Write a protein that binds this ligand. Structure first.
Ligand SMILES: [Cl-]
Ligand code: NA
Length: 200
């Protein structure tokens, strides 16, 4: 009844903007079920601008850096997965550009999401118009954690337009949403938008 840890979600190198945000996502499995931790050069990652959000019983961890500082935050970071029969490591590098030195094709948020208010049970759609070259792929974060529409059992859909849609809004859907535009050139976060649900 034992299996060493293995990464099922590995963090990727990122290129962010000064003042913006970067989130590295790391997740592992194994038996016993492992914990994952974020470190830098062996030391635990934890400061005012560096927060970790654990999920999946701590077998998952998001490292959110905000606001980004250059060149302070330009480093390699480590996600360490550990259980009783193994400890493994994956690396993710962070690059931080000044707004001044952004390449022309760097993702830009033409129109980010706004404060959303919706009557419980009704559909709420939050828009995100992003530009870039290549055309950025759009993802969303809720309360610092990545949203996964496909794993939402149909409660949440990402539209072809990049918009996030809640099919039948419940109180649980309230929170702080951010859209993220990512391409070969780097990553840019929209300003956050809160979603509030009002009584039916
Ligand atoms: Cl919107
Ligand atoms: Na990542």
């Amino acid at each position: 009844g034992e299996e060493p840890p293995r990464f099922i979600k590995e963090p990727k190198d990122q290129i962010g903007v000064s003042g913006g945000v970067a989130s590295f996502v790391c997740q592992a499995t194994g038996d016993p079920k492992p914990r994952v931790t974020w470190n830098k050069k062996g030391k635990k990652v934890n400061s005012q601008r560096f927060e970790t959000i654990e999920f999946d019983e701590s077998a998952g961890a998001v490292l959110r850096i905000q606001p980004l500082r250059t060149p302070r935050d330009e480093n390699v970071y480590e996600c360490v997965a550990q259980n009783s029969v193994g400890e493994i490591t994956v690396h993710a590098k962070l690059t931080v550009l000044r707004e001044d030195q952004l390449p022309s094709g760097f993702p830009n948020i033409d129109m980010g999401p706004q404060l959303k208010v919706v009557e419980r049970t009704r559909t709420a759609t939050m828009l995100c118009a992003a530009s870039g070259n290549p055309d950025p792929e759009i993802t969303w974060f809720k309360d610092f954690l990545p949203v996964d529409p496909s794993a939402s059992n149909g409660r949440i859909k990402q539209l072809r337009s990049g918009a996030l849609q809640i099919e039948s809004s419940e109180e649980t859907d309230q929170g702080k949403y951010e859209c993220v535009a990512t391409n070969s050139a780097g990553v840019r976060y929209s300003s956050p938008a809160n979603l509030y649900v009002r009584v039916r």
